Amino acid sequence: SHMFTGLNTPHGVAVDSAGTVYVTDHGNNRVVKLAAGSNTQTVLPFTGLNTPSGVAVDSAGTVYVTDHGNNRVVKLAAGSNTQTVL
Amino acid sequence: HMFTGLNTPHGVAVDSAGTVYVTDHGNNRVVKLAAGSNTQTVLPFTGLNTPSGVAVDSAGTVYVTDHGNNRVVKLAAGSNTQTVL
Amino acid sequence: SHMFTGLNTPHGVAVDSAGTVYVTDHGNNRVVKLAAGSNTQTVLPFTGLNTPSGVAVDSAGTVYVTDHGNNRVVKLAAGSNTQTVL
Ligand SMILES: [Co+2]
């Protein structure tokens, strides 16, 4: 048959001009960043995510997330605390 | 919304100008949105099946994993005709 | 299939300053790259991958890949090919 198929939602990783690494985390519905040096994982203040699939970071440090399960793209303008929906 | 009509987005990339590129997996297409734009453009890729990853180089060429077709395609800036890698 | 070959359900793509294209060849548990105007794909020396997904590359040529679904991020250091878990 193959009556049931499903796709695995993608996992994203991105690295900014300074080597800081940004990762989607499906199980905790969050996006985290890891500055190399400090042994600290920062949870970024995105909200209400459902299975973030992709992350990118522009020159200005702005972070963008494909929020797969909510059919949208969210961003966090660098040192803004409020998420915009694109 | 400002991106409009997305279904199950798989991937996002951002170019040096802050233009945002998105794989719209559920609709088999790739869309883009300039930094702080109202309007979105659909890129002229063709015959995609569940596009997934997207990247953009410093020349503005857009690369996409055509996950359902096991291939990678690319589109030069302002081109209408993709190349398969 | 022109120059990439034998891909199965690929996920992430990334491109470096040299225009080298990196593809997470998800279905084959490997990461492949294609140098500008080369006709030969290179399988990077990651080991122990399983359903990898996202891929990024920094200016230094370090490659990061999401791996074992949600479990981890693997970093391949340029030159040494030392693999570390982020
Ligand atoms: Co989807």
**A9 CA to chain B: closest CA distance, Å?**
7
Q: Any residues with CB less than 8 A from the CB of C19 and at least 6 apart, and which?
A: B57, B59, C36
Q: Which chains share 3+ C-beta pairs under 8 angstroms with B? A: A, C
Q: How much is the CA Rg of chain B, to the nearest whole Å?
A: 12
Q: Any residues with CB less than 8 A from the CB of B17 and at least 6 apart, and which?
A: B34, B35
Indicate the burial class of C79 (C-beta count within 10 angstroms; 0-12, 13-18, 19 or more): exposed
User: A60 and B18: CB-CB below 8 Å?
Assistant: yes
Resolution (Å) of this entry: 2.0
CA dihedral in degrees (A68, A73, A78, A80; nearest 10)? -100
CA dihedral in degrees (A71, A7, B13, C21; nearest 10)? -170
Distance CA B29, CA B47 (A): 9
Instruction: Give, in order, the Cα–Cα distances in Å from B33 to each of A11, B7, B17, B62, C75.
Output: 22, 16, 11, 13, 30
Pick the CATH number of B1-85 from 2.60.40.420, 3.40.50.170, 3.30.70.20, 2.40.10.500: 2.40.10.500
Residues shown for chain C: 86
Domain ranges of chain A: 1-86
Question: Residue C67 CB: number of other CB atoms within 10 A?
Answer: 25
Residue type, B47: G
User: A59 and B18: CB-CB below 8 Å?
Assistant: yes
Distance CA B79, CA A14 (A): 27
